[PDB]
């Protein structure tokens, strides 16, 4: 055997649901692109309709005018209510629901107890004989408490590794430390059940990831977790 335990970590990420709002510099450029587009385009069928109607009215068989139809479009739009980009969970700061922070990616964190101490880490399982290292990460989903989620794994190679040693208490020749390997996957659809939410798992971004993780553990995690 080996003195380092092999643990197959899993890094489940929630892709952004809504587009991130444009920066003030981007807003200025966005207006310029549309302003240039109008100046370098021909008259549309709607614009040519309005000009002809103006000439005919000035001189004097269309029931609906160009401007009149535009008002109808505006009235229908004001009746429909668009989805709220900022959800209630954002106001409540409930870091357990996927509904929060739709603009940014979310990383799953689960709290586990080691040495009679609770530590927030990524989901992981011990490697077993006759099983690939990637298959260990897929097994972690089955061990979760009442989870119905389909994860999309990208490749087979690990996305990171962390090494730690027992603090001279349980350190032995047969068990000197452990080497975890992080596997990233995409959360296609699904969410946890309502049985256990608060103490079970939380979903935070990379910026708010350091609060839960340890400084040494966070060092190897902020490397394969992007903030784009």
């Amino acid at each position: 055997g080996s003195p380092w335990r092999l643990l197959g970590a899993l890094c489940l990420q929630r892709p952004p649901v809504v587009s991130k709002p444009l920066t003030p510099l981007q807003e200025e450029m966005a207006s310029l692109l549309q302003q240039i587009e109008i100046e370098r385009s021909l008259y549309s069928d709607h614009e040519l309709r309005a000009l002809d109607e103006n000439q005919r009215l000035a001189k004097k068989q269309d029931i609906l005018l160009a401007q009149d139809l535009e008002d109808m479009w505006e009235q229908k739009f004001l009746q429909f209510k668009l989805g709220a980009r900022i959800t209630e969970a954002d106001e409540k700061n409930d870091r357990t629901s996927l509904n929060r922070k739709l603009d940014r990616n979310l990383v799953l964190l689960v709290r586990e107890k080691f040495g009679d101490q609770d530590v927030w880490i990524l989901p992981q399982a011990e490697w077993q004989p006759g099983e690939t290292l990637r298959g260990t990460a897929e097994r972690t989903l089955a061990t979760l408490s009442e989870n119905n989620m389909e994860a999309k794994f990208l490749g087979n190679a690990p996305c990171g590794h962390y090494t730690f040693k027992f603090p001279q208490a349980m350190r032995t020749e047969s068990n000197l430390g452990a080497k975890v390997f992080f596997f990233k996957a995409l959360l296609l659809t699904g969410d946890f059940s309502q049985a256990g939410n608060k103490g079970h798992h939380v979903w935070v971004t990379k910026d708010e990831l350091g609060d839960y993780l340890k400084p040494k553990y966070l060092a190897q995690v902020r490397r394969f977790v992007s903030d784009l």
């Binding site: 952004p16 991130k20 692109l33 549309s44 709607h46 739009f77």
Partner: protein, 51 residues
């Protein structure tokens, strides 16, 4: 970021004017697209056959 390649303009020598419109999907989600007419919103109805 979704803004990495989002802000662009029509790179055509000849083309008709387009207006920024919202395309509401069948589940309420909306997306910014450019339409021929200045319709403030567009909502795709649900097909009767796909029921």
């Amino acid at each position: 970021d979704s803004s990495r390649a989002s802000l662009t303009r029509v790179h055509r020598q000849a083309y008709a004017r387009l207006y920024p419109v919202l395309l509401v999907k069948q589940d309420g989600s909306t997306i910014h697209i450019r339409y021929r007419e200045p319709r403030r919103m567009l909502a795709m109805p649900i097909d009767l056959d796909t029921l």
